[PDB]
Amino acid sequence: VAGKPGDFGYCDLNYCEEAVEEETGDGLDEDSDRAIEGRTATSEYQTFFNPRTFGSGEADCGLRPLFEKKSLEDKTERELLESYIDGRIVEGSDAEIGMSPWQVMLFRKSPQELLC
Amino acid sequence: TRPYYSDVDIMRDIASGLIGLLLICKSRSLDRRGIQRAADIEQQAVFAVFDENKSWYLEDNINKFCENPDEVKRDDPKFYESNIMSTINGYVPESITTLGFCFDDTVQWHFCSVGTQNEILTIHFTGHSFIYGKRHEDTLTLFPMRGESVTVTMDNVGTWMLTSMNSSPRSKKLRLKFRDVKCIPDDDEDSYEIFEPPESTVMATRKMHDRLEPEDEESDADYDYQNRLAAALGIR
């Protein structure tokens, strides 16, 4: 498109409401079966963008100087099996300072109110 | 319980001591060995009546391995009944172990009685019983070929006999002498047994002390915490 030097629009077409659920063909899969318990992974990350026209955020990922490189567990990811005891009514427990590093929100200079 | 045996021969290899038992267990695979959850050890009971003429090593009796060629122990009832014997754990007379369990013994009793018979075989228990079929029966009845399994909790105090009611060669010598005592829980404070209630002075580490630094136990150990949640018991 033209107009203003910015973005471009996409075309739309009315197809069908077919959902991408389970495949009805045959009835088999192709997934793994184990991946044995044992942290044997150096750096097998992926890269899609380019550092030249995007910046950082390519290598420094998932490396928090807390309980990640030290191979320890604090009070964050405490999710075992779904068959814990099934589920009843949720409550929402307390928290602790230091377990929620990332926190990006929106605010206004005047007045200072919470947005989204 | 699925007893295994040689497939080259059918009836002669069983008499030569080529028979055992296999545990085709369910989906309680915890580690590389499979921790039997809600279970313990195993106590079996085999009674196979065979003969030397039935085994393949008949030549290692009266002809080759022999030192009396002038008098052959054949065509006589003495040498015939000397081979007709009922064995248990490789012990024809009596076994070296006893059935004296204790409390909190979620073991799985197994029974088998192969041989040259075809009908059903039974055994009467005096003063002792078992648990099967969501009930509490006294005696049971096994079957040949396949193996019979039953989870029995042995809770009793005293000593009695476990004789059968038949004719004479299988009712007069098929008894069992053992003493079952539990004073007070599992009886491990002043006796000798491979159990522990514990119920004693525990100032450090003893039995039933599952304190692990990462995580104690739950269902499996697929990862450091198991993140895929789909633990079934077969094909969904």
Side-chain angles (χ1 to χ4, degrees), chain A residues 27 29 31 33-39 73 77-84, chain B residues 30 32 214-215 218-219 221-231 236:
Chain A
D29 296 326
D31 202 5
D33 289 315
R34 178 66 184 192
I36 267 183
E37 177 188 9
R39 300 172 187 178
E73 298 292 338
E77 295 182 353
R78 297 291 88 181
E79 292 279 1
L80 228 304
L81 221 288
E82 186 190 5
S83 297
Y84 238 0
Chain B
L30 274 298
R32 258 63 64 173
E215 183 65 26
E218 180 152 332
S219 183
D222 174 66
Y223 205 8
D224 57 78
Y225 220 62
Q226 192 168 8
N227 291 328
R228 189 174 183 278
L229 321 180
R236 46 88 180 180

PDB file of all heavy atoms in Angstrom, chain A residues 27 29 31 33-39 73 77-84, chain B residues 30 32 214-215 218-219 221-231 236:
ATOM      1  N   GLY A  27      -5.069 -42.023  13.156  1.00  0.00           N
ATOM      2  CA  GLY A  27      -5.273 -41.964  14.590  1.00  0.00           C
ATOM      3  C   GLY A  27      -4.000 -42.137  15.394  1.00  0.00           C
ATOM      4  O   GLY A  27      -4.050 -42.457  16.585  1.00  0.00           O
ATOM      5  N   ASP A  29       0.253 -40.643  16.164  1.00  0.00           N
ATOM      6  CA  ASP A  29       0.964 -39.390  16.393  1.00  0.00           C
ATOM      7  C   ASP A  29       2.404 -39.468  15.900  1.00  0.00           C
ATOM      8  O   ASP A  29       2.733 -40.297  15.046  1.00  0.00           O
ATOM      9  CB  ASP A  29       0.935 -39.024  17.879  1.00  0.00           C
ATOM     10  CG  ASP A  29      -0.466 -38.744  18.383  1.00  0.00           C
ATOM     11  OD1 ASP A  29      -1.287 -38.206  17.610  1.00  0.00           O
ATOM     12  OD2 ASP A  29      -0.749 -39.061  19.558  1.00  0.00           O
ATOM     13  N   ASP A  31       4.956 -37.767  18.312  1.00  0.00           N
ATOM     14  CA  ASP A  31       5.619 -37.040  19.387  1.00  0.00           C
ATOM     15  C   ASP A  31       6.657 -37.927  20.066  1.00  0.00           C
ATOM     16  O   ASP A  31       6.799 -39.107  19.733  1.00  0.00           O
ATOM     17  CB  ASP A  31       4.588 -36.559  20.409  1.00  0.00           C
ATOM     18  CG  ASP A  31       5.082 -35.382  21.230  1.00  0.00           C
ATOM     19  OD1 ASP A  31       6.187 -34.875  20.944  1.00  0.00           O
ATOM     20  OD2 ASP A  31       4.364 -34.965  22.164  1.00  0.00           O
ATOM     21  N   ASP A  33       8.531 -39.647  23.626  1.00  0.00           N
ATOM     22  CA  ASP A  33       8.016 -40.667  24.532  1.00  0.00           C
ATOM     23  C   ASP A  33       8.595 -40.560  25.938  1.00  0.00           C
ATOM     24  O   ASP A  33       8.080 -41.197  26.862  1.00  0.00           O
ATOM     25  CB  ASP A  33       8.290 -42.059  23.954  1.00  0.00           C
ATOM     26  CG  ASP A  33       7.434 -42.364  22.744  1.00  0.00           C
ATOM     27  OD1 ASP A  33       6.221 -42.075  22.792  1.00  0.00           O
ATOM     28  OD2 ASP A  33       7.969 -42.882  21.741  1.00  0.00           O
ATOM     29  N   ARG A  34       9.649 -39.767  26.131  1.00  0.00           N
ATOM     30  CA  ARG A  34      10.310 -39.682  27.427  1.00  0.00           C
ATOM     31  C   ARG A  34      11.059 -38.366  27.595  1.00  0.00           C
ATOM     32  O   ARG A  34      10.578 -37.463  28.287  1.00  0.00           O
ATOM     33  CB  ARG A  34      11.283 -40.847  27.618  1.00  0.00           C
ATOM     34  CG  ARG A  34      12.059 -40.811  28.927  1.00  0.00           C
ATOM     35  CD  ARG A  34      11.154 -40.998  30.130  1.00  0.00           C
ATOM     36  NE  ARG A  34      11.888 -40.873  31.385  1.00  0.00           N
ATOM     37  CZ  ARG A  34      11.393 -41.212  32.567  1.00  0.00           C
ATOM     38  NH1 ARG A  34      10.165 -41.704  32.656  1.00  0.00           N
ATOM     39  NH2 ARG A  34      12.129 -41.070  33.662  1.00  0.00           N
ATOM     40  N   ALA A  35      12.243 -38.274  26.982  1.00  0.00           N
ATOM     41  CA  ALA A  35      13.279 -37.316  27.341  1.00  0.00           C
ATOM     42  C   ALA A  35      13.649 -37.514  28.808  1.00  0.00           C
ATOM     43  O   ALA A  35      13.057 -36.914  29.713  1.00  0.00           O
ATOM     44  CB  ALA A  35      12.832 -35.876  27.061  1.00  0.00           C
ATOM     45  N   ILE A  36      14.634 -38.382  29.028  1.00  0.00           N
ATOM     46  CA  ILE A  36      14.938 -38.906  30.357  1.00  0.00           C
ATOM     47  C   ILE A  36      15.295 -37.759  31.291  1.00  0.00           C
ATOM     48  O   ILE A  36      15.946 -36.787  30.888  1.00  0.00           O
ATOM     49  CB  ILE A  36      16.060 -39.960  30.277  1.00  0.00           C
ATOM     50  CG1 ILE A  36      15.465 -41.368  30.144  1.00  0.00           C
ATOM     51  CG2 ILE A  36      16.982 -39.883  31.475  1.00  0.00           C
ATOM     52  CD1 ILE A  36      16.496 -42.497  30.122  1.00  0.00           C
ATOM     53  N   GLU A  37      14.819 -37.848  32.530  1.00  0.00           N
ATOM     54  CA  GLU A  37      15.138 -36.881  33.577  1.00  0.00           C
ATOM     55  C   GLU A  37      16.650 -36.795  33.725  1.00  0.00           C
ATOM     56  O   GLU A  37      17.308 -37.774  34.083  1.00  0.00           O
ATOM     57  CB  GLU A  37      14.483 -37.293  34.889  1.00  0.00           C
ATOM     58  CG  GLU A  37      14.823 -36.391  36.058  1.00  0.00           C
ATOM     59  CD  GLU A  37      14.318 -36.934  37.385  1.00  0.00           C
ATOM     60  OE1 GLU A  37      13.856 -38.093  37.424  1.00  0.00           O
ATOM     61  OE2 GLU A  37      14.376 -36.199  38.392  1.00  0.00           O
ATOM     62  N   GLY A  38      17.203 -35.618  33.460  1.00  0.00           N
ATOM     63  CA  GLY A  38      18.635 -35.416  33.523  1.00  0.00           C
ATOM     64  C   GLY A  38      19.077 -34.241  32.676  1.00  0.00           C
ATOM     65  O   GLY A  38      19.135 -34.338  31.446  1.00  0.00           O
ATOM     66  N   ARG A  39      19.403 -33.128  33.332  1.00  0.00           N
ATOM     67  CA  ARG A  39      19.720 -31.872  32.652  1.00  0.00           C
ATOM     68  C   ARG A  39      21.033 -32.008  31.878  1.00  0.00           C
ATOM     69  O   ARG A  39      22.134 -31.793  32.392  1.00  0.00           O
ATOM     70  CB  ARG A  39      19.772 -30.730  33.660  1.00  0.00           C
ATOM     71  CG  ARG A  39      18.460 -30.530  34.404  1.00  0.00           C
ATOM     72  CD  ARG A  39      18.590 -29.531  35.539  1.00  0.00           C
ATOM     73  NE  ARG A  39      17.376 -29.457  36.347  1.00  0.00           N
ATOM     74  CZ  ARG A  39      17.245 -28.688  37.424  1.00  0.00           C
ATOM     75  NH1 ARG A  39      18.256 -27.930  37.821  1.00  0.00           N
ATOM     76  NH2 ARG A  39      16.108 -28.678  38.106  1.00  0.00           N
ATOM     77  N   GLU A  73      15.518 -24.560  43.085  1.00  0.00           N
ATOM     78  CA  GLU A  73      14.085 -24.307  43.018  1.00  0.00           C
ATOM     79  C   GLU A  73      13.658 -23.532  44.256  1.00  0.00           C
ATOM     80  O   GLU A  73      13.972 -23.935  45.381  1.00  0.00           O
ATOM     81  CB  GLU A  73      13.291 -25.615  42.909  1.00  0.00           C
ATOM     82  CG  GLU A  73      13.586 -26.422  41.656  1.00  0.00           C
ATOM     83  CD  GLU A  73      13.092 -25.746  40.390  1.00  0.00           C
ATOM     84  OE1 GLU A  73      12.177 -24.901  40.482  1.00  0.00           O
ATOM     85  OE2 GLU A  73      13.618 -26.060  39.302  1.00  0.00           O
ATOM     86  N   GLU A  77       7.553 -22.101  40.489  1.00  0.00           N
ATOM     87  CA  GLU A  77       6.922 -23.168  39.720  1.00  0.00           C
ATOM     88  C   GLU A  77       6.690 -24.379  40.617  1.00  0.00           C
ATOM     89  O   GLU A  77       7.544 -25.266  40.711  1.00  0.00           O
ATOM     90  CB  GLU A  77       7.789 -23.538  38.520  1.00  0.00           C
ATOM     91  CG  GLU A  77       7.934 -22.428  37.495  1.00  0.00           C
ATOM     92  CD  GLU A  77       8.756 -22.851  36.295  1.00  0.00           C
ATOM     93  OE1 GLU A  77       9.323 -23.963  36.323  1.00  0.00           O
ATOM     94  OE2 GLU A  77       8.834 -22.072  35.322  1.00  0.00           O
ATOM     95  N   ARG A  78       5.538 -24.415  41.281  1.00  0.00           N
ATOM     96  CA  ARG A  78       5.141 -25.535  42.125  1.00  0.00           C
ATOM     97  C   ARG A  78       3.960 -26.269  41.510  1.00  0.00           C
ATOM     98  O   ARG A  78       2.935 -26.499  42.160  1.00  0.00           O
ATOM     99  CB  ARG A  78       4.805 -25.067  43.539  1.00  0.00           C
ATOM    100  CG  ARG A  78       5.970 -24.443  44.296  1.00  0.00           C
ATOM    101  CD  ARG A  78       7.035 -25.472  44.655  1.00  0.00           C
ATOM    102  NE  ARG A  78       8.030 -25.643  43.597  1.00  0.00           N
ATOM    103  CZ  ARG A  78       9.048 -26.494  43.663  1.00  0.00           C
ATOM    104  NH1 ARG A  78       9.211 -27.253  44.738  1.00  0.00           N
ATOM    105  NH2 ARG A  78       9.906 -26.583  42.656  1.00  0.00           N
ATOM    106  N   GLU A  79       4.083 -26.639  40.238  1.00  0.00           N
ATOM    107  CA  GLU A  79       3.025 -27.324  39.506  1.00  0.00           C
ATOM    108  C   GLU A  79       3.489 -28.739  39.197  1.00  0.00           C
ATOM    109  O   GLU A  79       4.302 -28.946  38.289  1.00  0.00           O
ATOM    110  CB  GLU A  79       2.666 -26.577  38.220  1.00  0.00           C
ATOM    111  CG  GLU A  79       1.995 -25.224  38.435  1.00  0.00           C
ATOM    112  CD  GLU A  79       0.511 -25.346  38.735  1.00  0.00           C
ATOM    113  OE1 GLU A  79       0.008 -26.487  38.803  1.00  0.00           O
ATOM    114  OE2 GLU A  79      -0.155 -24.300  38.897  1.00  0.00           O
ATOM    115  N   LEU A  80       2.976 -29.710  39.951  1.00  0.00           N
ATOM    116  CA  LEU A  80       3.263 -31.110  39.677  1.00  0.00           C
ATOM    117  C   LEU A  80       2.258 -31.646  38.666  1.00  0.00           C
ATOM    118  O   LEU A  80       1.987 -31.002  37.651  1.00  0.00           O
ATOM    119  CB  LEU A  80       3.233 -31.933  40.966  1.00  0.00           C
ATOM    120  CG  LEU A  80       4.415 -32.882  41.203  1.00  0.00           C
ATOM    121  CD1 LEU A  80       4.593 -33.864  40.054  1.00  0.00           C
ATOM    122  CD2 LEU A  80       5.701 -32.108  41.440  1.00  0.00           C
ATOM    123  N   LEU A  81       1.692 -32.815  38.943  1.00  0.00           N
ATOM    124  CA  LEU A  81       0.735 -33.467  38.062  1.00  0.00           C
ATOM    125  C   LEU A  81      -0.637 -32.821  38.232  1.00  0.00           C
ATOM    126  O   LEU A  81      -0.992 -32.329  39.306  1.00  0.00           O
ATOM    127  CB  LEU A  81       0.675 -34.971  38.345  1.00  0.00           C
ATOM    128  CG  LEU A  81       0.589 -35.948  37.165  1.00  0.00           C
ATOM    129  CD1 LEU A  81      -0.777 -35.917  36.494  1.00  0.00           C
ATOM    130  CD2 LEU A  81       1.690 -35.664  36.154  1.00  0.00           C
ATOM    131  N   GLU A  82      -1.411 -32.815  37.147  1.00  0.00           N
ATOM    132  CA  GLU A  82      -2.793 -32.354  37.204  1.00  0.00           C
ATOM    133  C   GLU A  82      -3.627 -33.194  38.160  1.00  0.00           C
ATOM    134  O   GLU A  82      -4.583 -32.688  38.758  1.00  0.00           O
ATOM    135  CB  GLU A  82      -3.418 -32.377  35.807  1.00  0.00           C
ATOM    136  CG  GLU A  82      -4.812 -31.776  35.736  1.00  0.00           C
ATOM    137  CD  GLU A  82      -5.490 -32.043  34.407  1.00  0.00           C
ATOM    138  OE1 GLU A  82      -4.908 -32.772  33.577  1.00  0.00           O
ATOM    139  OE2 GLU A  82      -6.606 -31.525  34.192  1.00  0.00           O
ATOM    140  N   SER A  83      -3.274 -34.470  38.325  1.00  0.00           N
ATOM    141  CA  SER A  83      -3.943 -35.344  39.287  1.00  0.00           C
ATOM    142  C   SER A  83      -3.309 -35.187  40.673  1.00  0.00           C
ATOM    143  O   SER A  83      -2.999 -36.155  41.369  1.00  0.00           O
ATOM    144  CB  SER A  83      -3.895 -36.791  38.811  1.00  0.00           C
ATOM    145  OG  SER A  83      -4.599 -36.944  37.589  1.00  0.00           O
ATOM    146  N   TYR A  84      -3.098 -33.925  41.052  1.00  0.00           N
ATOM    147  CA  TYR A  84      -2.745 -33.576  42.422  1.00  0.00           C
ATOM    148  C   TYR A  84      -3.799 -34.165  43.346  1.00  0.00           C
ATOM    149  O   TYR A  84      -3.535 -35.117  44.086  1.00  0.00           O
ATOM    150  CB  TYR A  84      -2.668 -32.055  42.595  1.00  0.00           C
ATOM    151  CG  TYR A  84      -1.329 -31.536  43.073  1.00  0.00           C
ATOM    152  CD1 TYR A  84      -0.273 -32.398  43.324  1.00  0.00           C
ATOM    153  CD2 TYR A  84      -1.128 -30.175  43.279  1.00  0.00           C
ATOM    154  CE1 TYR A  84       0.950 -31.922  43.761  1.00  0.00           C
ATOM    155  CE2 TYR A  84       0.090 -29.690  43.716  1.00  0.00           C
ATOM    156  CZ  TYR A  84       1.125 -30.568  43.958  1.00  0.00           C
ATOM    157  OH  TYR A  84       2.343 -30.094  44.395  1.00  0.00           O
TER     158      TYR A  84
ATOM    159  N   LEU B  30       8.010 -46.705  38.494  1.00  0.00           N
ATOM    160  CA  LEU B  30       8.489 -45.456  39.079  1.00  0.00           C
ATOM    161  C   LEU B  30       9.886 -45.117  38.578  1.00  0.00           C
ATOM    162  O   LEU B  30      10.111 -44.042  38.011  1.00  0.00           O
ATOM    163  CB  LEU B  30       8.470 -45.551  40.606  1.00  0.00           C
ATOM    164  CG  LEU B  30       7.169 -45.202  41.339  1.00  0.00           C
ATOM    165  CD1 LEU B  30       6.788 -43.756  41.076  1.00  0.00           C
ATOM    166  CD2 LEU B  30       6.029 -46.139  40.957  1.00  0.00           C
ATOM    167  N   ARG B  32      13.894 -47.247  37.345  1.00  0.00           N
ATOM    168  CA  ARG B  32      14.365 -48.304  36.457  1.00  0.00           C
ATOM    169  C   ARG B  32      13.917 -49.686  36.911  1.00  0.00           C
ATOM    170  O   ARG B  32      13.866 -50.606  36.089  1.00  0.00           O
ATOM    171  CB  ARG B  32      15.891 -48.264  36.352  1.00  0.00           C
ATOM    172  CG  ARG B  32      16.418 -47.623  35.076  1.00  0.00           C
ATOM    173  CD  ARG B  32      16.016 -46.161  34.966  1.00  0.00           C
ATOM    174  NE  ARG B  32      16.597 -45.347  36.028  1.00  0.00           N
ATOM    175  CZ  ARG B  32      16.508 -44.023  36.085  1.00  0.00           C
ATOM    176  NH1 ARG B  32      15.861 -43.358  35.137  1.00  0.00           N
ATOM    177  NH2 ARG B  32      17.068 -43.361  37.090  1.00  0.00           N
ATOM    178  N   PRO B 214      15.009 -32.188  47.183  1.00  0.00           N
ATOM    179  CA  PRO B 214      14.194 -31.665  46.077  1.00  0.00           C
ATOM    180  C   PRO B 214      12.712 -31.939  46.274  1.00  0.00           C
ATOM    181  O   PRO B 214      11.940 -31.033  46.606  1.00  0.00           O
ATOM    182  CB  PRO B 214      14.741 -32.406  44.847  1.00  0.00           C
ATOM    183  CG  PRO B 214      16.024 -33.041  45.293  1.00  0.00           C
ATOM    184  CD  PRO B 214      15.815 -33.338  46.737  1.00  0.00           C
ATOM    185  N   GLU B 215      12.310 -33.190  46.063  1.00  0.00           N
ATOM    186  CA  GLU B 215      10.923 -33.604  46.216  1.00  0.00           C
ATOM    187  C   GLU B 215      10.904 -35.060  46.660  1.00  0.00           C
ATOM    188  O   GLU B 215      11.716 -35.865  46.197  1.00  0.00           O
ATOM    189  CB  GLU B 215      10.136 -33.426  44.911  1.00  0.00           C
ATOM    190  CG  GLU B 215       8.657 -33.777  45.011  1.00  0.00           C
ATOM    191  CD  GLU B 215       7.894 -32.846  45.935  1.00  0.00           C
ATOM    192  OE1 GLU B 215       8.324 -31.686  46.105  1.00  0.00           O
ATOM    193  OE2 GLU B 215       6.865 -33.276  46.496  1.00  0.00           O
ATOM    194  N   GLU B 218       5.507 -38.718  44.466  1.00  0.00           N
ATOM    195  CA  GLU B 218       4.141 -38.392  44.071  1.00  0.00           C
ATOM    196  C   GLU B 218       3.581 -39.446  43.122  1.00  0.00           C
ATOM    197  O   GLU B 218       2.789 -40.300  43.532  1.00  0.00           O
ATOM    198  CB  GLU B 218       4.065 -37.007  43.424  1.00  0.00           C
ATOM    199  CG  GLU B 218       2.660 -36.620  42.981  1.00  0.00           C
ATOM    200  CD  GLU B 218       2.428 -35.122  42.992  1.00  0.00           C
ATOM    201  OE1 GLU B 218       3.086 -34.421  43.791  1.00  0.00           O
ATOM    202  OE2 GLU B 218       1.587 -34.645  42.201  1.00  0.00           O
ATOM    203  N   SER B 219       3.987 -39.397  41.853  1.00  0.00           N
ATOM    204  CA  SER B 219       3.421 -40.292  40.851  1.00  0.00           C
ATOM    205  C   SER B 219       4.503 -40.903  39.973  1.00  0.00           C
ATOM    206  O   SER B 219       4.464 -42.102  39.679  1.00  0.00           O
ATOM    207  CB  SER B 219       2.403 -39.545  39.985  1.00  0.00           C
ATOM    208  OG  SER B 219       1.790 -40.417  39.052  1.00  0.00           O
ATOM    209  N   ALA B 221       8.702 -39.797  37.928  1.00  0.00           N
ATOM    210  CA  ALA B 221       9.910 -38.973  37.913  1.00  0.00           C
ATOM    211  C   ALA B 221      10.357 -38.799  36.464  1.00  0.00           C
ATOM    212  O   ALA B 221      11.472 -39.150  36.069  1.00  0.00           O
ATOM    213  CB  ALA B 221      11.001 -39.599  38.774  1.00  0.00           C
ATOM    214  N   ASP B 222       9.455 -38.243  35.657  1.00  0.00           N
ATOM    215  CA  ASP B 222       9.720 -37.998  34.244  1.00  0.00           C
ATOM    216  C   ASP B 222      10.728 -36.875  34.042  1.00  0.00           C
ATOM    217  O   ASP B 222      11.551 -36.950  33.123  1.00  0.00           O
ATOM    218  CB  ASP B 222       8.408 -37.689  33.511  1.00  0.00           C
ATOM    219  CG  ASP B 222       8.628 -37.290  32.066  1.00  0.00           C
ATOM    220  OD1 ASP B 222       9.076 -38.143  31.270  1.00  0.00           O
ATOM    221  OD2 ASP B 222       8.347 -36.121  31.727  1.00  0.00           O
ATOM    222  N   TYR B 223      10.693 -35.837  34.875  1.00  0.00           N
ATOM    223  CA  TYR B 223      11.584 -34.695  34.787  1.00  0.00           C
ATOM    224  C   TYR B 223      11.958 -34.255  36.206  1.00  0.00           C
ATOM    225  O   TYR B 223      11.799 -35.039  37.159  1.00  0.00           O
ATOM    226  CB  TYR B 223      10.907 -33.608  33.956  1.00  0.00           C
ATOM    227  CG  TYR B 223      11.856 -32.644  33.281  1.00  0.00           C
ATOM    228  CD1 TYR B 223      13.227 -32.865  33.282  1.00  0.00           C
ATOM    229  CD2 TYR B 223      11.376 -31.514  32.630  1.00  0.00           C
ATOM    230  CE1 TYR B 223      14.094 -31.983  32.665  1.00  0.00           C
ATOM    231  CE2 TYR B 223      12.233 -30.627  32.012  1.00  0.00           C
ATOM    232  CZ  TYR B 223      13.591 -30.866  32.030  1.00  0.00           C
ATOM    233  OH  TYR B 223      14.448 -29.985  31.413  1.00  0.00           O
ATOM    234  N   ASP B 224      12.451 -33.022  36.349  1.00  0.00           N
ATOM    235  CA  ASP B 224      12.750 -32.491  37.674  1.00  0.00           C
ATOM    236  C   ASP B 224      11.482 -32.137  38.437  1.00  0.00           C
ATOM    237  O   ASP B 224      11.532 -31.910  39.652  1.00  0.00           O
ATOM    238  CB  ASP B 224      13.659 -31.264  37.563  1.00  0.00           C
ATOM    239  CG  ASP B 224      13.064 -30.167  36.700  1.00  0.00           C
ATOM    240  OD1 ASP B 224      12.178 -29.431  37.186  1.00  0.00           O
ATOM    241  OD2 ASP B 224      13.488 -30.037  35.532  1.00  0.00           O
ATOM    242  N   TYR B 225      10.343 -32.088  37.744  1.00  0.00           N
ATOM    243  CA  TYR B 225       9.069 -31.765  38.360  1.00  0.00           C
ATOM    244  C   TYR B 225       7.881 -32.294  37.567  1.00  0.00           C
ATOM    245  O   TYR B 225       6.741 -32.122  38.011  1.00  0.00           O
ATOM    246  CB  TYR B 225       8.932 -30.244  38.538  1.00  0.00           C
ATOM    247  CG  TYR B 225       8.301 -29.822  39.848  1.00  0.00           C
ATOM    248  CD1 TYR B 225       8.899 -30.134  41.062  1.00  0.00           C
ATOM    249  CD2 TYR B 225       7.117 -29.094  39.870  1.00  0.00           C
ATOM    250  CE1 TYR B 225       8.331 -29.745  42.263  1.00  0.00           C
ATOM    251  CE2 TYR B 225       6.541 -28.698  41.065  1.00  0.00           C
ATOM    252  CZ  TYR B 225       7.152 -29.028  42.259  1.00  0.00           C
ATOM    253  OH  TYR B 225       6.583 -28.638  43.449  1.00  0.00           O
ATOM    254  N   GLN B 226       8.119 -32.930  36.414  1.00  0.00           N
ATOM    255  CA  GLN B 226       7.080 -33.513  35.568  1.00  0.00           C
ATOM    256  C   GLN B 226       6.090 -32.455  35.091  1.00  0.00           C
ATOM    257  O   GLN B 226       5.174 -32.074  35.825  1.00  0.00           O
ATOM    258  CB  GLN B 226       6.355 -34.641  36.308  1.00  0.00           C
ATOM    259  CG  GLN B 226       5.467 -35.503  35.422  1.00  0.00           C
ATOM    260  CD  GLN B 226       4.993 -36.764  36.125  1.00  0.00           C
ATOM    261  OE1 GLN B 226       5.199 -36.928  37.327  1.00  0.00           O
ATOM    262  NE2 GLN B 226       4.358 -37.659  35.377  1.00  0.00           N
ATOM    263  N   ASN B 227       6.257 -31.988  33.852  1.00  0.00           N
ATOM    264  CA  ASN B 227       5.472 -30.861  33.362  1.00  0.00           C
ATOM    265  C   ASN B 227       4.350 -31.269  32.416  1.00  0.00           C
ATOM    266  O   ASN B 227       3.452 -30.457  32.165  1.00  0.00           O
ATOM    267  CB  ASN B 227       6.387 -29.850  32.668  1.00  0.00           C
ATOM    268  CG  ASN B 227       7.307 -29.135  33.638  1.00  0.00           C
ATOM    269  OD1 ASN B 227       6.947 -28.902  34.792  1.00  0.00           O
ATOM    270  ND2 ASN B 227       8.499 -28.782  33.176  1.00  0.00           N
ATOM    271  N   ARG B 228       4.377 -32.488  31.877  1.00  0.00           N
ATOM    272  CA  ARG B 228       3.291 -32.982  31.028  1.00  0.00           C
ATOM    273  C   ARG B 228       2.364 -33.818  31.906  1.00  0.00           C
ATOM    274  O   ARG B 228       2.777 -34.764  32.578  1.00  0.00           O
ATOM    275  CB  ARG B 228       3.831 -33.776  29.846  1.00  0.00           C
ATOM    276  CG  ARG B 228       2.760 -34.125  28.826  1.00  0.00           C
ATOM    277  CD  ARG B 228       3.348 -34.795  27.598  1.00  0.00           C
ATOM    278  NE  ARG B 228       2.332 -35.062  26.583  1.00  0.00           N
ATOM    279  CZ  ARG B 228       1.520 -36.115  26.598  1.00  0.00           C
ATOM    280  NH1 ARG B 228       1.602 -37.002  27.580  1.00  0.00           N
ATOM    281  NH2 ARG B 228       0.624 -36.280  25.634  1.00  0.00           N
ATOM    282  N   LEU B 229       1.082 -33.456  31.886  1.00  0.00           N
ATOM    283  CA  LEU B 229       0.111 -33.999  32.834  1.00  0.00           C
ATOM    284  C   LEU B 229      -0.894 -34.910  32.123  1.00  0.00           C
ATOM    285  O   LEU B 229      -1.967 -34.495  31.685  1.00  0.00           O
ATOM    286  CB  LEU B 229      -0.585 -32.859  33.567  1.00  0.00           C
ATOM    287  CG  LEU B 229       0.313 -31.675  33.939  1.00  0.00           C
ATOM    288  CD1 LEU B 229      -0.476 -30.591  34.655  1.00  0.00           C
ATOM    289  CD2 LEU B 229       1.497 -32.126  34.779  1.00  0.00           C
ATOM    290  N   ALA B 230      -0.520 -36.184  32.017  1.00  0.00           N
ATOM    291  CA  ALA B 230      -1.343 -37.203  31.381  1.00  0.00           C
ATOM    292  C   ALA B 230      -0.932 -38.611  31.805  1.00  0.00           C
ATOM    293  O   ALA B 230      -0.495 -39.413  30.977  1.00  0.00           O
ATOM    294  CB  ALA B 230      -1.285 -37.066  29.860  1.00  0.00           C
ATOM    295  N   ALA B 231      -1.070 -38.925  33.094  1.00  0.00           N
ATOM    296  CA  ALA B 231      -0.671 -40.228  33.627  1.00  0.00           C
ATOM    297  C   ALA B 231      -1.896 -41.135  33.697  1.00  0.00           C
ATOM    298  O   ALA B 231      -2.705 -41.082  34.627  1.00  0.00           O
ATOM    299  CB  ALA B 231      -0.012 -40.072  34.993  1.00  0.00           C
ATOM    300  N   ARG B 236      -5.672 -44.759  26.155  1.00  0.00           N
ATOM    301  CA  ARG B 236      -6.811 -43.891  26.434  1.00  0.00           C
ATOM    302  C   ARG B 236      -7.945 -44.135  25.442  1.00  0.00           C
ATOM    303  O   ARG B 236      -7.727 -44.674  24.358  1.00  0.00           O
ATOM    304  CB  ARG B 236      -6.380 -42.419  26.407  1.00  0.00           C
ATOM    305  CG  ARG B 236      -5.515 -42.027  25.214  1.00  0.00           C
ATOM    306  CD  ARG B 236      -6.349 -41.594  24.017  1.00  0.00           C
ATOM    307  NE  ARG B 236      -5.519 -41.228  22.873  1.00  0.00           N
ATOM    308  CZ  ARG B 236      -5.997 -40.816  21.703  1.00  0.00           C
ATOM    309  NH1 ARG B 236      -7.307 -40.716  21.516  1.00  0.00           N
ATOM    310  NH2 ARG B 236      -5.167 -40.504  20.718  1.00  0.00           N
TER     311      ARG B 236
END
